Amino acid sequence: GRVRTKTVKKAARVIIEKYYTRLGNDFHTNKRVCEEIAIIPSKKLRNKIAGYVTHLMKRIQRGPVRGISIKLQEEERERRYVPEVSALDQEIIEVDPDTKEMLKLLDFGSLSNLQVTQPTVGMNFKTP
Amino acid sequence: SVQVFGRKKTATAVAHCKRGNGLIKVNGRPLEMIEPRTLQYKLLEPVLLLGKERFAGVDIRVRVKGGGHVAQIYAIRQSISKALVAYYQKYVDEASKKEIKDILIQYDRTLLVADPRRCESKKFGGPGARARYQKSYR
Amino acid sequence: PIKLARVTKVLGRTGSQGQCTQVRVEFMDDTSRSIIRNVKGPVREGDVLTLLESEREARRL
């Protein structure tokens, strides 16, 4: 089993929160990055840290990760909608007539952009 | 001129390969004079595979030590193949090295690539690495 | 007679002692159907089975 333990995937994430301007997608660059940016004892931890920051940079640039901070949103405020006509600009709004009685008794409904539709017959809304 | 080894085990063979009119000698005896003859084709496998024209410029002298007999045979054939490929990369052009390496690797990878397996140690409580003693209950 | 079958998918190991896999077997010889049979031994997809009795489907053991 090759599951990464707590230190090689917490330490890799605290390495990724700062120092994002140095990291990349290739493993052999980040492996050489990791000794200027940290004090790690011997290399098998450092190769495992480099493997997880390469896997995390493989993950992270196509969407949000839960564990990573809004330094991601600093990338999405650094790198990144409405329609032309709004979806609330429709020209006929169907209104079933209890709403029309409400609008008439709120001193509206003299103005007509709406169209009242026919009331339902049958009251079978419950489940058996 | 190259000398380049091949090993399988604590058996170690290195061939001394320099320029000539054709030769193969394993510790002063030629390749048709080695003792196991149910394994005669293993040492002859570059001679049958590459042909005697591919050896046509070299004098190969093989010196072996260590190991058993069969591990010594498997180091002889690997050292011979690495001898010809090291001569071919230094003195012949590299497409000939490419042709000789795909004709040698695709047949058998122990002709060019070593064996990383060594004998694992005995530990206590049993007569081998894994086996354990008979452990009566009553 | 004797109908040959081809494996498309493996459906997990089964049995009391865990010895028998069961697979989806599609027939080749004169017939076309896709059924479950259970095997003894290691299978991969693309294995060819040889069924003496040719009809029986096998749920569980």
Binding site: - | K8, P36, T38, L39, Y41, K42, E45, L48, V70, Y74, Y107, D108, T110, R117 | L4, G15, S16, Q17, Q19, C20, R37, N38, V39, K40, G41, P42, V43, R44, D47, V48, L49, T50, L51, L52, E53, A58, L61
Partner: protein
């Protein structure tokens, strides 16, 4: 032109089954000069199938404890047994080994169920790699047990065993036990 033992062509022999076409490794890539490869083949699931069939054949003759570990003894035995095939029958012996292994793997078998010691068995069928290696085990039994106590030596007995599974005579312990352990799967149904 890779020839087995210096003398055997691998170019011409006929695997007449589809199910063992990738599971008897004798054809052109697996043409080797010798039945020794010193391989790393049983280190993964399904790398032991594309070990050559001759290499599996000489390793399965190493079986009992007087003859454990000794490979070149069985290389010598399989060499003289293949020459016994070429002298007694005179056909290509690689068709005799292919015909023995294709013909003698039992196509149906039985499993034990019944919660560990009340005997009610159930019939299922056999995977093809299990058929190939079951066939080599039923071919290496027979011949050693039929040259255990005899004046006959082993090489004639083993080559005759591969002959006797290549043609299907029912003196063959591979064929005899094939029919028996498929007919009890016929019986527990």
């Amino acid at each position: 032109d890779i020839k087995l033992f210096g003398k055997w062509s691998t170019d011409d022999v006929q695997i007449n089954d589809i199910s063992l076409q990738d599971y008897i490794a004798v054809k052109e890539k697996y043409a080797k000069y010798l039945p020794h490869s010193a391989g790393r083949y049983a280190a993964k699931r399904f790398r032991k199938a594309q070990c050559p069939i001759v290499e599996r054949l000489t390793n399965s003759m190493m079986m009992h404890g007087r003859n454990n570990g000794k490979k070149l003894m069985t290389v010598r035995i399989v060499k003289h047994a293949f020459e016994i095939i070429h002298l007694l029958t005179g056909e290509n012996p690689l068709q005799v080994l292919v015909n023995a292994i294709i013909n003698s793997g039992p196509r149906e078998d039985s499993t034990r169920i019944g919660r560990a010691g009340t005997v009610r068995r159930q019939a299922v069928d056999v995977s093809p790699l299990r058929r190939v290696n079951q066939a080599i085990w039923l071919l290496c039994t027979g011949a050693r047990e039929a040259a255990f106590r005899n004046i006959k030596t082993i090489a004639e007995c083993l080559a005759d065993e591969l002959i006797n599974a290549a043609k299907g005579s029912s003196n063959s312990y591979a064929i005899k036990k094939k029919d028996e352990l498929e007919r009890v799967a016929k019986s527990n149904r």
